[PDB]
Ligand binder design. Sequence first.
Ligand SMILES: *[C@@H]1O[C@H](CO)[C@@H](O[C@@H]2O[C@H](CO)[C@@H](O)[C@H](O)[C@H]2NC(C)=O)[C@H](O)[C@H]1NC(C)=O
Ligand SMILES: *[C@@H]1O[C@H](CO)[C@@H](O[C@@H]2O[C@H](CO)[C@@H](O)[C@H](O)[C@H]2NC(C)=O)[C@H](O)[C@H]1NC(C)=O
Ligand SMILES: *[C@@H]1O[C@H](CO)[C@@H](O[C@@H]2O[C@H](CO)[C@@H](O)[C@H](O)[C@H]2NC(C)=O)[C@H](O)[C@H]1NC(C)=O
Ligand SMILES: *[C@@H]1O[C@H](CO)[C@@H](O[C@@H]2O[C@H](CO)[C@@H](O)[C@H](O)[C@H]2NC(C)=O)[C@H](O)[C@H]1NC(C)=O
Ligand SMILES: *[C@@H]1O[C@H](CO)[C@@H](O[C@@H]2O[C@H](CO)[C@@H](O)[C@H](O)[C@H]2NC(C)=O)[C@H](O)[C@H]1NC(C)=O
Ligand SMILES: *[C@@H]1O[C@H](CO)[C@@H](O[C@@H]2O[C@H](CO)[C@@H](O)[C@H](O)[C@H]2NC(C)=O)[C@H](O)[C@H]1NC(C)=O
Ligand SMILES: *[C@@H]1O[C@H](CO)[C@@H](O[C@@H]2O[C@H](CO)[C@@H](O)[C@H](O)[C@H]2NC(C)=O)[C@H](O)[C@H]1NC(C)=O
Ligand SMILES: *[C@@H]1O[C@H](CO)[C@@H](O[C@@H]2O[C@H](CO)[C@@H](O)[C@H](O)[C@H]2NC(C)=O)[C@H](O)[C@H]1NC(C)=O
Ligand SMILES: *[C@@H]1O[C@H](CO)[C@@H](O[C@@H]2O[C@H](CO)[C@@H](O)[C@H](O)[C@H]2NC(C)=O)[C@H](O)[C@H]1NC(C)=O
Ligand SMILES: *[C@@H]1O[C@H](CO)[C@@H](O)[C@H](O)[C@H]1NC(C)=O
Ligand SMILES: *[C@@H]1O[C@H](CO)[C@@H](O)[C@H](O)[C@H]1NC(C)=O
Ligand SMILES: *[C@@H]1O[C@H](CO)[C@@H](O)[C@H](O)[C@H]1NC(C)=O
Ligand SMILES: *[C@@H]1O[C@H](CO)[C@@H](O)[C@H](O)[C@H]1NC(C)=O
Ligand SMILES: *[C@@H]1O[C@H](CO)[C@@H](O)[C@H](O)[C@H]1NC(C)=O
Ligand SMILES: *[C@@H]1O[C@H](CO)[C@@H](O)[C@H](O)[C@H]1NC(C)=O
Ligand SMILES: *[C@@H]1O[C@H](CO)[C@@H](O)[C@H](O)[C@H]1NC(C)=O
Ligand SMILES: *[C@@H]1O[C@H](CO)[C@@H](O)[C@H](O)[C@H]1NC(C)=O
Ligand SMILES: *[C@@H]1O[C@H](CO)[C@@H](O)[C@H](O)[C@H]1NC(C)=O
Ligand SMILES: *[C@@H]1O[C@H](CO)[C@@H](O)[C@H](O)[C@H]1NC(C)=O
Ligand SMILES: *[C@@H]1O[C@H](CO)[C@@H](O)[C@H](O)[C@H]1NC(C)=O
Ligand SMILES: *[C@@H]1O[C@H](CO)[C@@H](O)[C@H](O)[C@H]1NC(C)=O
Lengths: 171, 171, 170, 343, 343, 343
Amino acid sequence: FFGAIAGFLEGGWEGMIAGWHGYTSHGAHGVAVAADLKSTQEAINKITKNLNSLSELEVKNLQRLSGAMDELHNEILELDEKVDDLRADTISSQIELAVLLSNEGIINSEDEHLLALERKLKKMLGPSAVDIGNGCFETKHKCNQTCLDRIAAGTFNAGEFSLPTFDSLNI
Amino acid sequence: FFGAIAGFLEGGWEGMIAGWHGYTSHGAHGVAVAADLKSTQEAINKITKNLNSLSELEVKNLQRLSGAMDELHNEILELDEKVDDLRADTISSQIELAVLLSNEGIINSEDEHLLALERKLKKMLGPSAVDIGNGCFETKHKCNQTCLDRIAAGTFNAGEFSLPTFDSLNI
Amino acid sequence: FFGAIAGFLEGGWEGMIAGWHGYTSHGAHGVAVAADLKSTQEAINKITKNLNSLSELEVKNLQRLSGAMDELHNEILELDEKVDDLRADTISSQIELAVLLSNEGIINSEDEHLLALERKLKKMLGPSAVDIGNGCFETKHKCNQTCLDRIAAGTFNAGEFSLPTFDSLN
Amino acid sequence: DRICTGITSSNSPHVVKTATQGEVNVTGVIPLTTTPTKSHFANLKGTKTRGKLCPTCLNCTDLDVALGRPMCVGVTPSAKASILHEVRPVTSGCFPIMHDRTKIRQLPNLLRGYEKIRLSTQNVINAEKAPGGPYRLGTSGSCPNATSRSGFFATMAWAVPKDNNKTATNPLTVEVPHICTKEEDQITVWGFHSDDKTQMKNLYGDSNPQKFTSSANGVTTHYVSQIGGFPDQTEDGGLPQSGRIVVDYMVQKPGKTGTIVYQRGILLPQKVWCASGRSKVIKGSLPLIGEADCLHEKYGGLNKSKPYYTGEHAKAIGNCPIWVKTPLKLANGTKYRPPAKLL
Amino acid sequence: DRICTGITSSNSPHVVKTATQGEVNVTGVIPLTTTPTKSHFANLKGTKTRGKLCPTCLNCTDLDVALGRPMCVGVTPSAKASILHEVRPVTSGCFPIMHDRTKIRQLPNLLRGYEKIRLSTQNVINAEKAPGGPYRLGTSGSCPNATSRSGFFATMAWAVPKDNNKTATNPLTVEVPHICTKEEDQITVWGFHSDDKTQMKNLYGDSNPQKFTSSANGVTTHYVSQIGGFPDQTEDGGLPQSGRIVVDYMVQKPGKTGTIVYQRGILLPQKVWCASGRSKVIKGSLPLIGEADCLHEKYGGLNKSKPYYTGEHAKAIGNCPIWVKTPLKLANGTKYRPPAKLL
Amino acid sequence: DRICTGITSSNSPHVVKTATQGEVNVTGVIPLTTTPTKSHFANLKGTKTRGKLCPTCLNCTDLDVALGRPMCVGVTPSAKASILHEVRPVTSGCFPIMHDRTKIRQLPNLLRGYEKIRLSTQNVINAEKAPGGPYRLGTSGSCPNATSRSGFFATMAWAVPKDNNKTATNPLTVEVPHICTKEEDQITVWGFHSDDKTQMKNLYGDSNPQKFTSSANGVTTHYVSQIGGFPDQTEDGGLPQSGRIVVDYMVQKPGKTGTIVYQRGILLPQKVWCASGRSKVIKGSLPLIGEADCLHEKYGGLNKSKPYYTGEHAKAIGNCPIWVKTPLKLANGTKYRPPAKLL
Ligand SMILES: *[C@@H]1O[C@H](CO)[C@@H](O[C@@H]2O[C@H](CO)[C@@H](O)[C@H](O)[C@H]2NC(C)=O)[C@H](O)[C@H]1NC(C)=O
Ligand SMILES: *[C@@H]1O[C@H](CO)[C@@H](O[C@@H]2O[C@H](CO)[C@@H](O)[C@H](O)[C@H]2NC(C)=O)[C@H](O)[C@H]1NC(C)=O
Ligand SMILES: *[C@@H]1O[C@H](CO)[C@@H](O[C@@H]2O[C@H](CO)[C@@H](O)[C@H](O)[C@H]2NC(C)=O)[C@H](O)[C@H]1NC(C)=O
Ligand SMILES: *[C@@H]1O[C@H](CO)[C@@H](O[C@@H]2O[C@H](CO)[C@@H](O)[C@H](O)[C@H]2NC(C)=O)[C@H](O)[C@H]1NC(C)=O
Ligand SMILES: *[C@@H]1O[C@H](CO)[C@@H](O[C@@H]2O[C@H](CO)[C@@H](O)[C@H](O)[C@H]2NC(C)=O)[C@H](O)[C@H]1NC(C)=O
Ligand SMILES: *[C@@H]1O[C@H](CO)[C@@H](O[C@@H]2O[C@H](CO)[C@@H](O)[C@H](O)[C@H]2NC(C)=O)[C@H](O)[C@H]1NC(C)=O
Ligand SMILES: *[C@@H]1O[C@H](CO)[C@@H](O[C@@H]2O[C@H](CO)[C@@H](O)[C@H](O)[C@H]2NC(C)=O)[C@H](O)[C@H]1NC(C)=O
Ligand SMILES: *[C@@H]1O[C@H](CO)[C@@H](O[C@@H]2O[C@H](CO)[C@@H](O)[C@H](O)[C@H]2NC(C)=O)[C@H](O)[C@H]1NC(C)=O
Ligand SMILES: *[C@@H]1O[C@H](CO)[C@@H](O[C@@H]2O[C@H](CO)[C@@H](O)[C@H](O)[C@H]2NC(C)=O)[C@H](O)[C@H]1NC(C)=O
Ligand SMILES: *[C@@H]1O[C@H](CO)[C@@H](O)[C@H](O)[C@H]1NC(C)=O
Ligand SMILES: *[C@@H]1O[C@H](CO)[C@@H](O)[C@H](O)[C@H]1NC(C)=O
Ligand SMILES: *[C@@H]1O[C@H](CO)[C@@H](O)[C@H](O)[C@H]1NC(C)=O
Ligand SMILES: *[C@@H]1O[C@H](CO)[C@@H](O)[C@H](O)[C@H]1NC(C)=O
Ligand SMILES: *[C@@H]1O[C@H](CO)[C@@H](O)[C@H](O)[C@H]1NC(C)=O
Ligand SMILES: *[C@@H]1O[C@H](CO)[C@@H](O)[C@H](O)[C@H]1NC(C)=O
Ligand SMILES: *[C@@H]1O[C@H](CO)[C@@H](O)[C@H](O)[C@H]1NC(C)=O
Ligand SMILES: *[C@@H]1O[C@H](CO)[C@@H](O)[C@H](O)[C@H]1NC(C)=O
Ligand SMILES: *[C@@H]1O[C@H](CO)[C@@H](O)[C@H](O)[C@H]1NC(C)=O
Ligand SMILES: *[C@@H]1O[C@H](CO)[C@@H](O)[C@H](O)[C@H]1NC(C)=O
Ligand SMILES: *[C@@H]1O[C@H](CO)[C@@H](O)[C@H](O)[C@H]1NC(C)=O
Ligand SMILES: *[C@@H]1O[C@H](CO)[C@@H](O)[C@H](O)[C@H]1NC(C)=O
């Protein structure tokens, strides 16, 4: 919903093979595509942790009553069957809810990955690039596939195009 | 909480009638208000899907035991009554939890709609407008109700005021 | 995860004592640190409301069957014991889930507080400062501890350094 | 000029709960619950719904039918849902019964819990040849027929000694075989007749109390009869009688033989009930009027609009709304905002 | 200069679970659980709490009271909560009973499960005129009174034949009418006395074992007496006796007559229990000391601080914390961060 | 140039449910469920798993063992999990039993629900000295031993009058003491032998039906015997006999004495079962082949991979996956996007 309202590109890039999200460059080279591995790994780890959490749930076994005998205690055994059934029903619903919320979380965070990737791109491009607001930046220089690959790797330096750069704090 | 910290306007505009969120313009015209229909529809659709999800839950009927007769099996029937009661109680709690999280989601996303609407506005205003950071942009031109209405419609062109514009990629 | 991808500082500042999140300034003074009390209070209130919500849940008491006597109705009492156990088990799982979602919410919103604090900082610094994108702004002026403290208080004025400012709507 | 993002302001009387902001006011909501109103019961949509066991049998109670009263033997249709309208089922004819001395009243309610119920076409025991001398099969004017003044319950045989010089007898044993299919339970009806001293001598050749014991599926029941001083006749055929019968039933799972140990006055089982499957049973009232999505013990028939409901929780079958503690609402608007003004 | 947003760094020994980040360390938490400590039981805040059935009746056990022992007839207050302190209730006086031969010990525990309990002021049966010749109402020195050396249980009547030339009898039947309100259950107490050969002849005119059968609410019970060779007297009045009584009870729902079929030595019901409503029952100990929000079978009385608790789950009534498997905590700080430095 | 953030596009055949976007297509998923396949049963990993009560006793059924049939007395190992393989346990030797006249068939299934089961080494009652004249302890060729042609069930004693001039007797009473530990339940086995008129006269000095009653833990059972005309012998030793036995059991909680009231033909209890703890019981079949994480009534042994499972829910013990209504999936990719192109 965020991207839809904000005018983010609603389509996707088949070229993006090595990952889930990343960058595209648009110029005289046509169109280059590079996956960002950091963002992809982050998503994968969240999902993995999410899987672990769902797998940690433990519920009591449902077994026979030790004292209720067939024929002699049929009425009791009918109620016992009812208890088993309602238990299976209730825990099932609770699990479906847990899985539902997990999936809601995963799908929703996509636009947040883009927003984060946009911050990473902004710093690397330097103060000479212009922010359009739709997840795209306008640059003074050409960026072919080779240039994009260094952006995705975080090694891109605007100084190589004789453009100003932001320095990183020594921490 | 986001808007509170970020200094977003904590008040609202009664003029905004055709929708839930949108834009205001502040100048010599006084103050114009326009609802954004895209953002409002997005919110409405999320809620609608959310309603469907809550309505899909199915639980087993609670009926009488077929074998336990009144008087003859009062003790069993007391336990059966207990099972029904605990079932109603537990599922009720689970439903309240589902509804709570739904509502939490809907209210929380409000500031996210604003954040999205801000991105849409940033691109349309062009690179001559300055971003203040509180959801507001400073413009070189006047924007009365007629101007705002075209912003809300996504038809606004900065070229009409002899100002630079961002072009859209052909996709 | 947002900060990790966006290149936000992954470390923290021990100097930040009066609160949970805030600002640092980096210049010839070395490094100043000030907690933002608004952002800290917001987080604390959310958690407090969250605590109230979890404390509002009510479940039925589990007591003895009034009609089932020991010895006479052992079979019935075994099933009764089973029902109690499954109840305790089921609600426990549901509570753990609610708590987990609560905690997931609290931890996740941290980067959102920073994002919000960045908006507040952007307006106060004025249009002469430049946005780097990693939660940091480059300024034309020096900002020692005294300056940073006024930023945390929302009283900072760029006009004092002969720099342009944004005015607020009435 | 300055251009800003904003949110509307409108009347916000509605309240919803959140996890992080507590209760909040919003401009609009979608109600998720209603409180149903009490209506008559009805047929369950998509499911044949049982009321009377044998609806074609007029002036018959369910207990009359279950005991095999003359005029009350007919078709008992199958049903996957049933309405329990008599917590204490009564008879309305035939020979006077001392009902509360056994569990017999609940017999028709037991039957209705099955999907399919049928009365056997053959007798499970040959009463005339049963242990304890040859018997003639007794009848009574209390149990009339459209084509007869006298008769008796189809489910039992009033075994009274044929020979003159009839006398007291030791406890005799009959096996009651399971004659239904492997998929059916057999509900066997039996009992005993008693009277005053003289009539007992005439009928049985013994004026002493008689003893009876049944054994089936691990359950044993023991009865001792009463000679004279009976409680008033009730729920019977209207004719004065000096004696009374006591009637009981025993359930036999497939392949399980039952036993009855008896003396004089025995009412031997004849036609038995064969029953299979399960019917969904809830308390309700007659008559069934119309269709509903859901049958609810406290509200009767109702149709499902909202997903949840508030009010009194009770047993309910069909396509039903789910009970909740409070009238929940889904936010369909924005959180309340004070109107913003310029000066 | 450069100005940045940042998050504090502090000692973070506390751990909470998340869905997407696993377990994480945080600077602060709010504990949601405690482990209660074992305390004495107490009164339930806002609810009258029953311990002994008749607290004003001193030197009396709940079973003594339930049987209507002399000195143990008094007021039995209503209560919506009750403590079950005797899993096997004992007597402490009157005539020697062979308790384990019936379900009689559990009688006071059944009574405490009702909200209101009262002993009837009138007799349910006229014992003197009951079937089997006129009876004198027997008494015993084992059951003394503050104003008498002899007496008997208020709930029963020792029906012994008045007449000389008393002799053996056929099994006789009495109906036991329901004399409580339409809102009340009736718990009817009855039984039988037996002795050695000679004493039996004196009292009843028969030295053979006697037979007894009760029928109520679809339940039948059968008893045969014992002649001599009794187990030792226990839980009684201290006086040597050659005989013993066996005592039982039968529950009658409103409008339900019960029956007893008996011979010699019958202890006919007199004053019956009338009981309505429901009391919340849990196991505990006496005495009740103080007030508590919650009564818990394993921890006794406790007050509710935290919303949840850890430890041993058991039955619990009142304003109680909810049991959980692990000590949950709510994050009240920030996720751990390594201290940041310049060079 | 223009540089933008973007998301991949790939085949997205998989569907997951969301709260705000409904069902959506994604590039990849992690399945959370499987549907198990039906396999043989097996041993429960980490838990000793009981099949036959006494596995070393060959050519013995669980019921044979429980009754203490000659050749079928041996070690009955403890187990915290058990498989119920006989819903209607049969005998395969010794004296002919009319099984369905009591609850006796279920005896071994009751035993298997305990963790520890042992047969007592001492007799609970001295049968020779028991009430009703001195008895000789009967034996039969139907119950052979590897070292004897004749014998009888270890759990019972065929008490037949020693004395010539044996005659009919009044109902006698024996107490059956609890001889197990304070931690053990005692399951007492008893019964009675009957025959035709002549054989009855020879053995007992009475050709009339005999009566029997047991009382333990508030439960009373009543039996009347049968003289001649027995159903065919079955599940026995193969030798023709003119009589039959009826066998029952009564459960005695620690410190609870049981009683038996009897006449002629009594089979007095001897060796009793002592049982403590609880075993996890589910329905299954023999033999147990291999190890599994989980035992499931419908699928047999299975090992846990996925956290959940779909299919038929039923009772299941061990380290098991949790049943769910639908094959749930966790998103492990991105929501579907149409491929983007230039012109
Ligand atoms: C928030 O919602 C409440 C509840 O709907 C609004 O107040 C109600 O209005 C009635 C009218 O008589 C009065 O009882 C009180 O004003 C409120 N009722 C209760 C029970 O408190 C309240 O005005 C709303 N807040 C707004 C619109 O700002
Ligand atoms: C539940 O819904 C049914 C179906 O709409 C209602 O009955 C129908 O409407 C009228 C009677 O009011 C008849 O003309 C239709 O033929 C009925 N349909 C069927 C299939 O019988 C019924 O009254 C509703 N029950 C409620 C509202 O309690
Ligand atoms: C949620 O609220 C919206 C209004 O905010 C409802 O939609 C409006 O009312 C009718 C019904 O669709 C339409 O004619 C209007 O055009 C809608 N206004 C809009 C879309 O701005 C919507 O029906 C509500 N959802 C419910 C009640 O389920
Ligand atoms: C995070 O939490 C754990 C648990 O409180 C801390 O590790 C424990 O504390 C000390 C180590 O400093 C040991 O004595 C304990 O045995 C540790 N427990 C476990 C399970 O490892 C840890 O120090 C905390 N802080 C950080 C930064 O991880
Ligand atoms: C639960 O709380 C009550 C109320 O505080 C405690 O009892 C009170 O406090 C002292 C006890 O020494 C008395 O002076 C008060 O009069 C008591 N109030 C009453 C009994 O209503 C009680 O002790 C607490 N129980 C616990 C902590 O187990
Ligand atoms: C949650 O945690 C915060 C920890 O910061 C607590 O807030 C503290 O309490 C004081 C009150 O004197 C506040 O003024 C400060 O913001 C915090 N103190 C310090 C030293 O940082 C809050 O009380 C906690 N909530 C609980 C425990 O319910
Ligand atoms: C989304 O997923 C569904 C389910 O796999 C796809 O629907 C199937 O599409 C295939 C190929 O066109 C058909 O042959 C099946 O009949 C469809 N339905 C099923 C199996 O339920 C749908 O194509 C997917 N949409 C995409 C990938 O855009
Ligand atoms: C469950 O897992 C066990 C352990 O892997 C499987 O049995 C083992 O694997 C082979 C197969 O016979 C043997 O050589 C091992 O000795 C077995 N180990 C043990 C401890 O028995 C078993 O077959 C699996 N059951 C399934 C898949 O149903
Ligand atoms: C979730 O999906 C990702 C792929 O989208 C899986 O990651 C794969 O594992 C390899 C290891 O060789 C990684 O290097 C790649 O990212 C992926 N490659 C292939 C060929 O799968 C991840 O394992 C999945 N998680 C699961 C199935 O639990
Ligand atoms: C991108 O441009 C540079 C500069 O001319 C060139 O060296 C490099 O090979 C180009 N990359 C591709 C993939 O053509
Ligand atoms: C806004 O300004 C333009 C200036 O030409 C005018 O044409 C238009 O009508 C104005 N709109 C309103 C609502 O006054
Ligand atoms: C910060 O700089 C101002 C300007 O000179 C000075 O007056 C103030 O005292 C300084 N504060 C600190 C803490 O050095
Ligand atoms: C039922 O009795 C009424 C009169 O009481 C009569 O009109 C009707 O025909 C009877 N129905 C029968 C016998 O089926
Ligand atoms: C009437 O009863 C007689 C037996 O008394 C029976 O043979 C006959 O079939 C019955 N007739 C009807 C119509 O039920
Ligand atoms: C005839 O009567 C006598 C006396 O009651 C009885 O003992 C005898 O068995 C009878 N004869 C029969 C029934 O053939
Ligand atoms: C009866 O109660 C009094 C007062 O508590 C006590 O002193 C006396 O010893 C008791 N007698 C008994 C229990 O026999
Ligand atoms: C003592 O018992 C006698 C009868 O034995 C009775 O009349 C009297 O009321 C009793 N005294 C009481 C209960 O105080
Ligand atoms: C007196 O006793 C015997 C029987 O026990 C006998 O002489 C006579 O029938 C009896 N008289 C009676 C009971 O009136
Ligand atoms: C079991 O019985 C069969 C019957 O023919 C026999 O062959 C086998 O030896 C018996 N089992 C033993 C002796 O363990
Ligand atoms: C073998 O059989 C005999 C049969 O009477 C019996 O003693 C026992 O079961 C075995 N004999 C012993 C142990 O002396
Ligand atoms: C012999 O006479 C009868 C006949 O059975 C018998 O009951 C009695 O015990 C015997 N007499 C003696 C002294 O044993």
